[PDB]
Amino acid sequence: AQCEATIESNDAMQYNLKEMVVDKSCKQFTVHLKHVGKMAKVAMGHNWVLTKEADKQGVATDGMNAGLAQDYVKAGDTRVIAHTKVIGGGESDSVTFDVSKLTPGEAYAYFCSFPGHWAMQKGTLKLSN
């Protein structure tokens, strides 16, 4: 709603939103990730990671390599515009980020970097009015 959105992840390694639009009057945007499945975070944990579409595989590989204690995102990875924590079934997490980190026109990729999820669990984020 307004300068925020909610996205659901389930036990099928899917996000319910394939596209998110950040309104141009927004200086901050907030994403609330909900894991509406029942599986454990070691089994089917999920997060939400935002990168320029170019850096998606790089971030997903380094992220898989950072472990669960780093929420599968390489610590201080400059390519990650924002990310939630890794959560398990029945949980939620939120992240707010600065919209000046994004450029109009330019398309961004958001995905889940939990092992093996990036390929499938993905969507596009764009800035518009």
The residues that touch Cu ion, with contacts defined as CB under 5 A, are: 46, 112, 114, 117, 121
CB-nearer residue toward Cu ion: 84 or 121: 121
Minimum distance of Cu ion from residue 21's CB (angstroms): 22
CB-nearer residue toward Cu ion: 86 or 127: 86
User: How far does Cα 14 stand from its chain's mean position?
Assistant: 12
Distance between CA atoms of residues 77 and 123, nearest Å: 20
Task: Tokens 């890794």: give the residue.
Answer: 86
The residue among 1, 5, 2 whose CA lies nearest residue 31 is: 5
Minimum distance of Cu ion from residue 46's CB (angstroms): 3
Minimum distance of Cu ion from residue 89's CB (angstroms): 12
CB-nearer residue toward Cu ion: 122 or 127: 122
